[PDB]
Symmetry: D2
């Protein structure tokens, strides 16, 4: 998911829309924008789809005001396509709205405590609504008016003690202003920027990725620190404050491998350069362990892996060629009455340039292997194009555990690397050879760009969950969320 | 506006939709339906437009569950076309949603108290959102779970003491059930019905008008009494309770004149038969005061007045003829870059039968006169059709004061009767004669069908507001709403 | 169906839209408008639904120009809801568009001929597309340009020979102007009107009914004559000419009974007055035949029959009461997975005022009886409302044969009056009594407003088709059109359930 | 624009859609699909927007049949976003529909001829409707039925003699089948493929580019030849014929430079390899003429130039770095009452990786320079990202003349290179240095993948127009279309705002 907040001095509706279009890669399922207008009321538009489809001229006319937040949704367990999008808001106390990228690992417990202790109903299965209601609960403890910055930071601190998981959040409180804050492990990304208007007026903004600030001409200030909160008043004063105990920086490694845009800087690390370093490390691993293999050409599975595969080819002294082309535009496969049922095909996303495979031993490079269904189909496409041997190298280590921090993944049983060794994975997918980045090399490739990061969030790779509350029990509460998601999606199709 | 609530034993989405389609005359601007599904979550669809345009197949699939409420909106000051429709809901305490037909005369004070004492923000200018938050605030006082019927009625009693105005309300509380309640002066209409499914299972419903029960095959039980509350649990038990001090029945006169459907029975009065009575009284008054006039034909302004004009013609011993035909379908006027300026016409709503006016002294009958714009244009249509003399009779008395109880009216300065006598109105609208029902006759015509009603809500006619809190100051706070209503609409078209 | 054409000196899009809205009762399934813009090109918008939903502001900006035509469709066979609507157009010769209310009875023969002699393909099952292509092929025989009015009139005469059935039509020819014409037996209605803008410029319009002239402030000129053709040039001159051999006036009778609006005048006959007379004729017949029956009240089945039942209640010297209320708003029923309807379909349409039926012998009045299922259920409503005895009177004669002149009718097999006698019909539907209007009485009621009309189109009542082309083969052709129209409608709903 | 035609033995709707999606880069303004269903009726769905927006579930149940064509529109003059999209059809003779990538240079003459000699009205300004009518005209001379292959090819040859310009067409004729043909200079791309379903039933398809064959699993047969016509019958038989005298292969160079997809093979030439070769020639030219310049890094303007820049960086022994990222999603700007944009035009399209420019002399590589306002703003971006010297290299020669053969382009007075030398362009756009591909190097680079091609369509670079009818009368005719296209688009926006 992606989030943005703009505390401006002139209308923000178009700017938030623009920032969301450059964060659109963080989630295409739904989008929402909410502003505070001159009457101190929330104006909202959200709906399924891409940003450019969700917001029409009439909705922009509605989204009046100089402060607002936006969200793009990647479907995750509990927040399925069939469900209500973000942002959510509550009318009490004061009027609060929140958007968030991440996942709460104690959602279930929090729901119960909200009900039993506060009689606060949660109407969806989105942990974002839970998070909003905890925050609102802590804000409701104050009697005096207005709230002071210390009251707001105290409720954020309280929230951080109650909730666990990973989160970057932006929120607004009517009559007060905009807050943003980050989980105490710095897992999910969040940056702060500013745009000077004149001697007395500065605008501020926060976003998941720095490209959102770039595209609007905001000056990058810094990453929001692990556990830190920001509060920008309606009058434009900036406050900051640490609101977690023992904050530490454990950035998500998947942002660098695949999820974020290459022109972003996350926790001082250029995503582009991290990815080039991944290619260096994997190229060096291939040169040492596959010295005996006959490789004619190195071919990326676009788009993420193009620069990774270029660096591998360079280390190996081998030609780089664009043997695959990704269709910029993908369409739906309709269900006509009867007729051909053809579906679940990878040619809808990729086309092979036949001349780049014919009678060649090809080294394919992908960013990751998840279910392995897609890589099996890619290998077959390469053989149909005339490849002799097909080798596959993964920029990411083996993906063996589910991500419960906001990156959507199948359960452990649908991960091909779960319970299996490289050579077994190789035989299932039909490759003549298969090699994965080593985790310590992936870690080193990213630390190279900021050696101050001592540990990353690696759970999908090694099963170490830094929030220490993930057990097989909890993994089964998540399957009963994915079960209900798929029924809600399913009952929309019947329509 | 119109409301409906159904506490069923099987899915209610289609039934609520069907009920709203037969209450659609109570408001065409917007529609909303909300249900409670099997997961004890609210499912909502609301939007601008007619019921048939608001709810499509994908929305009905969403609206799961066996309990639900619906609303159709008539644009009113505070709840403009451009604004959020009903129903509203809040997630705390418990999860509450409400729909309402009426208006709160102390909305302004209530909003302030909600903010200062409860930190409860109101995001729209709809008094129904305020009403919901007052109710939620009183429900929030209880700690034990679940609430008992007694707690709910107590929070309603507390709400009635805080709010003033007119209201028929239906609401749902997650984990509990459906409530309905009516203001202590019984101004806005509300009826209760039931449908037996078997020996242990009965469904209940409430609606603004009895025709909603009829169309779904619910047995009519009774009007909800002034100040009464109804609570139907999720398991199908009905409780009732008086929740106001000194309740009294002052039904809105306007429902009988024009607003309700003729096949409804409100507080035991057939609307159709009240309207025939209005015809009897006005025809008699015409026979007495206009004895010397040459009248050739009696022509109603359709559709409300058709049965009224019939009774008038029968008293006068004069022929009834359908001189005007109401276009069942009306369309928009479009703004094109080179566009024409002729929007104002009433020919877009009405067509004259030329043969029925040529060389005749015509007595036209309409249900009411508000701005007089439409009347002037209707009289002119009769003259263009060939009429010689044109007389106009109004089933309702002179409309001189704004309605602040849920019937949308213009401000007193846009009311043509405001500050004017009959003959002066007559000459503005271009008529050769003008006559109004007497208020006491209108009252007698409706009271004939239920003599138990001592006093009606008559404020549009005589300026007597039964809630005793309407002063020129409050009339100004309403102009500030209509001021902001129009700014929202100008922003949409633009 | 209903049709409008306006030859104006100023933009026509809004005016046509408003004319279609007051003709909307003639067909609610589809609508279309086509204009000729200032570049001499057609601009078109047509689609399923009501006029108010079909035409949005984006479609209306496109419909530029001072001349255009409009159509609203009533759904039939060969012109189903799921099919392409009117108007249709062809770009050769010259550029022609046409809109028609009616039905050709030699449609099959005409399609074959168009294919064989002119290699003209017909893409739809709409007879109006066939009619348009005949007219196009007749205009294609002239070399010189521009066409003269004589040419255009010739082409229309040649068309009248070729085709058979009932038709009112309006068409436009790019570079020339607007035409309208009526079938040679004047079955389908069509009127002409004018509107003076100044001494030099006059606008003209034609419409299915006069209320469309009225609503736009056009002065009525006359009904178009059977077989007559109107031609209005782009420069605003009105030409006319008889284009049929043997033109006679046989206006359709169902227009008067319930299809037209009461405030229209069709061939000099007031629909409203026609209908009051029908109440007179039928109330007399009731008093004579049902002298011995105890009628408490006359209750109409709204809305067409309210004025009919009023007159009947007068003749019978009995009270009239609004015992039924037609629901102004009927919604869609949703095909809902595993759900049950609480709502009887008769209640979708009507509601009963309980107090007006309770413990009374009631005489219900309806405008007609087609399938009898509907009639049966209305009677049932009265009983559960409290009525003791329930009598039913029908303002029209028994309906026994289908209309093939433009009025969508079920097949004879479905008409409850086919092969059945009146006391038979009564037993099925459940009436304690049933009576019909006599065709001769119905005819008297209508001729009384214009004795110059000697014969009416009465086929639905008596089986006599003025075109003489109606046989069991053509009826089977119209039923293979129904099946395919119903198979195409079914396919839209299979796939519109994702 | 891009075109598809599939002549199959099972439903083609989804296949045609899938193929248009992989040709979607050839035009995103509008899309149309039309099929011949079981009753030899055309079935159509066309509208503005992307393929995935245009065709909903409801439109695809409608598009029944085993034969069909498709089109995606790149917005040009006379075929604007606010205009009716392709495909068009006519219903005489027989029923014909056609889809076209190209442009007729004698469109005005051909409309005159169609009107005077045939009385065929052309309702839009799309030259595709004119081409369809000319062909329909030539097909109507043949009177006996059915048409024979030789009749159809005769019609196509007659059409090629009448029309001038550039075209790739696919068309269908009801009752007969599908044809496809190519202008006699082979300017616009068109390939042919097949898919064997057993030893009796082969499906065929044509398309603008081979990737559409690939994505559906059709084996590639060959490029349709310059002036050649293909005809595929309803039974499944493939015939061909040369239908021009003096056919010659002059393929569009712009397809190779950037318009086509790299994974396509156009006249036996891999677009990918041609673009690598373009970077080789350009890196060589730079190594020679800029020997003395200090280049830190080569940075492509994505996406088309990434492979070109990689090869240049190779030739120069300098680092290649992704300093610019193209924004995959662009979104609309709303006409905003009293509002100030915070977003520069150039930032909607591109974003700068600041770390890749800071304190470096950078060589930017782009596929072309047209107006140069864009290029100026990209150079400014690099400077604000922190670059010292900013050099710019264009994979294409100077663009000096308008393309009149189907690639939308501005008029010559709008082209920055028109009437100017390299150093003047450099100073205007604000580059420290500027260098263009030499035209002979471009020709060599593309030729090296197939030396059988002697000459290319180069008009935009050198003014040589191969069809020899591009006068000021036609260039004025085009600027008249653009003026009216603008007025129509402006009217749509005003009506929406209002
Ligand atoms: N630019 C342009 N577009 C035209 C013109 N004429 C029609 N169209 C558009 O193409 C579509 C025409 O197809 P329709 O007649 O609507 O038929 P269909 O919806 O059953 O496919 C419409 O888009 P749609 O997606 O179906 O939307 P809607 O307008 O029907 O709601 C309409 O807006 C024209 O002259 N110029
Ligand atoms: Mg909506
Ligand atoms: Mg459409």
């Amino acid at each position: 998911c992606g989030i943005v907040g703009i505390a401006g001095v002139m209308p923000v509706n178009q700017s938030i829309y623009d920032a969301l279009t450059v964060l659109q890669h963080r989630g295409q399922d739904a989008a929402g924008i909410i502003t505070i207008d001159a009457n101190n009321c929330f104006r909202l538009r959200k709906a399924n789809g891409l940003v450019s489809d969700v917001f029409e001229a009439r909705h922009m006319q509605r989204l009046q005001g100089n402060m607002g937040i936006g969200h793009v949704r990647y479907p995750t367990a509990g927040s399925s396509s069939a469900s209500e999008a973000q942002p959510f808001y509550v009318n009490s106390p004061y009027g609060i709205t929140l958007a968030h990228n991440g996942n709460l690992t104690n959602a279930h417990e929090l729901r119960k405590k909200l009900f039993e202790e506060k009689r606060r109903h949660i109407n969806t299965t989105s942990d974002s609504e839970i998070l909003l209601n905890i925050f609102a609960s802590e804000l409701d403890n104050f009697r005096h008016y207005p709230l002071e910055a210390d009251n707001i930071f105290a409720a954020i601190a309280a929230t951080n003690r109650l909730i666990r998981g990973a989160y970057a959040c932006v929120a607004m409180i009517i009559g007060h202003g905009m807050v943003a804050f980050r989980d105490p492990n710095g897992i999910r990304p969040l940056v702060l920027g500013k745009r000077d208007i004149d001697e007395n007026r500065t605008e501020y903004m926060v976003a998941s990725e720095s490209v959102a600030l770039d595209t609007l001409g905001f000056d990058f200030l810094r990453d929001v620190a692990p556990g830190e909160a920001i509060y920008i008043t309606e009058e434009g004063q900036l406050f900051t404050r640490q609101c977690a105990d023992n904050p530490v920086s454990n950035p998500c490694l998947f942002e660098y491998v695949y999820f974020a845009r290459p022109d972003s800087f996350i926790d001082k690390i250029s995503v582009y350069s991290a990815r080039v370093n991944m290619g260096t490390k994997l190229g060096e691993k291939i040169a040492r362990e596959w010295e005996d293999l006959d490789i004619d050409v190195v071919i990326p599975i676009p788009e993420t892996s193009c620069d990774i595969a270029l660096e591998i080819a360079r280390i190996l002294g081998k030609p780089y060629r664009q043997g695959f082309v990704k269709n910029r535009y993908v369409g739906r496969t309709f269900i006509m009455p009867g007729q051909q049922l053809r579906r679940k095909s990878v040619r809808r996303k990729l086309n092979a340039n036949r001349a780049e495979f014919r009678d060649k031993n090809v080294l394919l490079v992908d960013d990751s292997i998840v279910r392995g269904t897609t890589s099996e189909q890619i290998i077959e496409m390469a053989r149909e194009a005339g490849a002799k041997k097909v080798y596959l190298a993964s920029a990411a280590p083996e993906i063996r555990f589910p991500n419960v921090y906001g990156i959507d993944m199948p359960s452990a049983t649908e991960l091909i690397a779960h319970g299996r060794e490289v050579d077994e994975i190789r035989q299932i997918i039909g490759a003549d050879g298969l090699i994965f980045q080593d985790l310590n090399d992936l870690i080193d490739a990213v630390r190279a760009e900021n050696p101050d990061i001592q540990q990353f969030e690696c759970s999908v790779f090694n099963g170490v969950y830094v929030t220490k509350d993930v057990d097989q029990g909890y993994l089964d509460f998540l399957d009963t969320l994915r079960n209900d998601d798929a029924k809600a999606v399913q009952r929309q199709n019947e329509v």
